[PDB]
Structure formats: C-alpha cells, structure tokens
Ligand SMILES: CCCCCCCCCCCCCCCCCCCC(=O)O[C@H](COC(=O)CCCCCCCCCCCCCC)COP(=O)(O)OCCN
C-alpha cells in the first residue's frame with residue numbers, strides 16, 4: 001503493498017532549460033507520467049483514478065511545485081555557482097506497512113547521481129546526505145529550512161495528501 005511512489009528526474013543544461021522525466025506508481029503499478037521541457041511539462045494520470053475536477057486541482061499543485069523547484073535551482077546557481085549540465089533526481093512517496101501504526105514517508109534528492117539532501121518529514125526539516133561540506137549544500141539547506149510555509153506544506157503533502165490518496169485509491173488496484 002500500500003504505497004504511492006513518485007520519481008522526478010530533471011536534466012538542466014543551464015539554469016533556464018530543464019527536461020523533466022518522471023512517473024508515479026500506486027501499489028507497484030504505473031499510474032502517472034511526467035514528461036517534457038520546462039516550456040511544456042505534461043502530467044497525466046494513466047488510470048482514471050481522480051475525477052476531472054479533482055485531478056485538475058492535483059495537477060495545478062504539481063505544476064506549482066515544478067515552478068518553485070526550478071526557481072530554487074536558479075536561485076542556488078545565482079548565489080553559489082552551479083556547474084551545468086546537471087541531473088537532479090527526486091524520489092518521494094508514502095507507504096503503509098502491514099505491521100505499522102504510521103505511514104513511512106520520504107523525499108530524497110540526488111544530484112548527478114550522488115546523495116545530496118533528504119527530508120525529515122515529521123520535523124519538516126531538510127538534512128544534507130553528503131558528508132562533504134560545500135557552499136552549495138549549505139545554501140540549499142538554508143533556503144529549504146527557512147521559516148516559511150513551504151517545508152510545512154511539503155510535510156502535509158507527504159503525511160496527509162499522499163497517505164489519503166493511497167487509502168482512497170489502493171482498492172482500485
Ligand atoms: C497524491 C497526490 C499526487 C498524485 C500523484 C501524482 C504524480 C504525477 C507526477 C509524477 C511524479 C512527479 C514528482 C512529483 C513531486 C511533487 C509533489 C508535489 C509537491 C507539493 O505539492 O509540494 C508543496 C510544497 O512545495 C514544495 O515543497 C516546494 C519544494 C521546492 C524544492 C524542492 C525540494 C528538492 C530540493 C531542490 C533541489 C535544489 C538543488 C540545488 C543544487 C506542498 O503541496 P501543495 O500545497 O502545493 O499541494 C496541495 C496538496 N498538499
């Protein structure tokens with residue numbers, strides 16, 4: 001299993017040009033696709049799990065996550081100098097264990113194939129997964145952990161929205 005996993009791969013050839021490739025699976029079955037350049041990013045449910053008005057709402061929130069994700073990469077480069085091209089991998093989701101009182105939720109980010117940062121969702125705080133210190137990772141963490149709604153919203157998305165989605169739709173699988 002009872003889980004929703006989401007994968008997003010973002011290839012930046014420079015701060016203003018990104019190619020997205022992603023997908024999500026519910027209970028081990030492919031259910032959603034993310035594809036295309038920043039200029040036209042398509043997000044589709046392969047199975048008709050949400051009715052059109054509810055999907056439309058889900059999709060605008062996903063597009064707004066992408067806009068902010070891209071904005072943060074541009075901001076990091078603008079303050080600390082990223083080396084392009086680069087590939088960012090976001091792997092996130094929620095799982096209901098059979099022997100569990102509580103969902104396991106996660107959000108891990110890799111850059112160029114190596115561990116970069118990950119979310120500690122209960123405290124709604126990000127940590128470095130690199131043991132290597134860097135101005136890039138320090139600045140990225142300073143932005144991610146700022147006292148604004150963004151990290152508390154992400155916690156709600158993983159702990160509430162994702163979990164309720166699994167509880168509602170896992171039957172249809
Ligand atoms: C169950 C519903 C979904 C159904 C399944 C759909 C799957 C279709 C697509 C395939 C998978 C693609 C990946 C999707 C991931 C995004 C998920 C949404 C995230 C999101 O909405 O976050 C909002 C906060 O934004 C943020 O948290 C912004 C964060 C910005 C930074 C990103 C963190 C990574 C670090 C950046 C790298 C920097 C690198 C520098 C070198 C909170 O939700 P909401 O209120 O908007 O929506 C309302 C619902 N809660």
Ligand SMILES: *[C@@H]1O[C@H](CO)[C@@H](O[C@@H]2O[C@H](CO)[C@@H](O)[C@H](O)[C@H]2NC(C)=O)[C@H](O)[C@H]1NC(C)=O
Pocket residue numbers: 005006007022023024025030
């Ligand atoms: C997103 O799609 C990719 C590509 O189909 C999935 O990765 C494959 O997963 C299968 C089954 O686990 C493996 O046999 C392949 O080796 C994987 N290929 C690659 C290139 O990684 C991935 O599991 C999907 N993720 C989600 C959350 O749906």
Ligand SMILES: *[C@@H]1O[C@H](CO)[C@@H](O[C@@H]2O[C@H](CO)[C@@H](O)[C@H](O)[C@H]2NC(C)=O)[C@H](O)[C@H]1NC(C)=O
Pocket residue numbers: 082083084085086087111112
């Ligand atoms: C991510 O990986 C890419 C490709 O491996 C890196 O791009 C290289 O950057 C070096 C500078 O050290 C250039 O000499 C090469 O021309 C680039 N390779 C290409 C264009 O294929 C990029 O620097 C890496 N970035 C991070 C942040 O790890």
